[PDB]
From TrEMBL, chain A:
GO terms for cellular component: viral capsid. This is Capsid triplex subunit 1. GO terms for biological process: viral capsid assembly. It comes from Suid herpesvirus 1. The lineage of its organism: Viruses, Duplodnaviria, Heunggongvirae, Peploviricota, Herviviricetes. The chain holds residues 124 to 246 of 368 of the full protein. Keywords: Capsid protein, Host nucleus, Virion. One of its GO terms (molecular function) is DNA binding.
From TrEMBL, chain B:
It comes from Suid herpesvirus 1. Transmembrane segments: none annotated. The chain holds residues 51 to 99 of 1330 of the full protein. This is Major capsid protein. It comes from the Viruses. The lineage of its organism: Viruses, Duplodnaviria, Heunggongvirae, Peploviricota, Herviviricetes. The gene is UL19.
Length: 123, 49
């Protein structure tokens, strides 16, 4: 897309304003599932994402890989158990998308992560 | 004297503008109706919407 880096910069300024004004972005971004399909006109799309069930019950119109998986930028994926050293053994683990605020006037930012663990209650 | 020019309505071409049927019990019927159903065709669009 055109003008994209500029838009990324403006979006950064938007989120940094959001935390400054005490209307936090977690009250501005509900989460949908993982997209699988789309038909696009010129600058107008119709994405389609799962909402319940497991991802690979779907059927993508790629015809190279009908099913899919879930991809997360490894730069942000922060594991917890192996981090906290619970001494546990990896079985079925939950998955949490977490936001990190920091508040210092005119000098503030937001950190994102995707956390997995067996812990049902983060707290 | 003078004759009397008789005329029958079905001979005139105006008859083909309507269907005429005797209904000898019209004096009894309340407000009658007629039911239509119609099914508009449709053409398949595509794209986003």
């Amino acid at each position: 897309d055109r003008r994209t880096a500029a838009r990324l910069e403006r979006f950064a300024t938007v989120l940094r304003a959001m935390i400054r004004s005490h209307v936090f972005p977690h009250r501005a971004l509900h989460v949908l599932g993982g997209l699988l399909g789309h038909v696009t006109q010129d600058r107008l799309a119709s994405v389609t994402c799962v909402a319940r069930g497991d991802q690979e019950a779907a059927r993508t119109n790629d015809m190279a890989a009908r099913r899919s998986q879930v991809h997360v930028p490894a730069c942000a994926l922060m594991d917890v158990d192996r981090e906290l050293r619970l001494g546990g053994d990896d079985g079925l683990r939950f998955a949490y998308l977490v936001f990190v605020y920091t508040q210092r006037h005119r000098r503030e930012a937001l950190r994102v992560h995707v956390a997995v663990s067996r812990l049902p209650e983060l707290g | 004297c003078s004759t009397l020019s008789l005329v029958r309505f079905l001979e005139l071409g105006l008859s083909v503008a309507c269907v005429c049927t005797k209904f000898p019990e019209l004096s009894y019927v309340a407000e009658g109706t007629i039911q239509f159903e119609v099914q508009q065709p449709m053409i398949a669009r595509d794209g986003p919407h």
